[PDB]
């Protein structure tokens, strides 16, 4: 299938990745740059993010979802349901509001597209309404990450998908900080895209530190696999 082969050719090997974020939470401005690689055949991403502005004013785990669904491994039986690769190389817009339970919210807009060989995720984040001494601004989140299933549906109206899901950030009293995600994706180009039947992506994420890195940073390893249509 030349449409499948096309994303299969853009993603059938290891693909360098760049991520650039400009953020403002409760007016605290910060920038982050990330680099790494993705191997869609295996659902694998490895990335290292650096805060280029000094200390990151929010917990690194609250940014994990914002910092590449085109790197999911879609099983061969499910290749018709891969919207994310179908939009490449021109790419897609990914927008979210993330509602933190009893606290503020992030609103993000990202463009995910190729720039030559490199797959770029360029993001603007605004955060509003955070409590000074809540779990976000107070840095009360553990540096770890649970596994989550993400439910994808078509938004045929908008020639894209809608994505909805709740992340649980563990807190160091056994509590969770809920982060309620509402997501919309739409293609950047005017070409054909795959509008999926409802399915999920299963995510696992591991957070770590580069023992040689003095800058505020996060090393992120994620495995992502599509399922949910036998």
UniProtKB/Swiss-Prot annotation:
Per UniProt, which keywords does this protein have? Answer: Chromophore, Luminescence, Photoprotein
Classification via Gene3D superfamilies: Green fluorescent protein
Instruction: State how changing residue 198 to I affects the protein, per the record.
Output: In mut2.1; shifts fluorescence lifetime from 3.03 to 2.50 ns
Query: How does biotechnology exploit this protein, per its UniProt record?
Result: Green fluorescent protein has been engineered to produce a vast number of variously colored mutants, fusion proteins, and biosensors. Further generation of mutants led to more stable proteins (at 37 degrees Celsius for example) with brighter fluorescence and longer fluorescence lifetimes.
Q: Name one GO biological process term.
A: generation of precursor metabolites and energy
Instruction: Please tell me in which tissues this protein is expressed.
Output: Photocytes.
Lineage: superkingdom? Eukaryota
Q: What is the effect of changing residue 155 to V?
A: In EBFP2.0; shifts the excitation and emission spectra to shorter wavelengths and increases quantum yields compared to BFP
Q: What, per the annotation, is the impact of changing residue 147 to P?
A: Increases fluorescence at warmer temperatures such as 37 degrees Celsius
Q: How is it modified after translation?
A: Contains a chromophore consisting of modified amino acid residues. Maturation of the chromophore requires nothing other than molecular oxygen.
- What SUPFAM superfamilies does the database record attribute to this sequence? GFP-like (SSF54511)
Impact of changing residue 145 to F on the protein? In Sapphire/H9-40; exhibits a huge Stoke's shift, with an excitation peak at 399 nm and an emission peak at 511 nm. In Azurite; shifts the excitation and emission spectra to shorter wavelengths and increases quantum yields compared to BFP
Q: Which family does it belong to?
A: Belongs to the GFP family.
What does it do? Energy-transfer acceptor. Its role is to transduce the blue chemiluminescence of the protein aequorin into green fluorescent light by energy transfer. Fluoresces in vivo upon receiving energy from the Ca(2+)-activated photoprotein aequorin.
User: Whom does it interact with, and what assembly results?
Assistant: Monomer.
**Name assigned to this protein:** Green fluorescent protein
Organism of this sequence: Aequorea victoria (Water jellyfish)
Ranked from the top, the taxonomy reads: Eukaryota, Metazoa, Cnidaria, Hydrozoa, Hydroidolina
Q: Which gene encodes it?
A: GFP
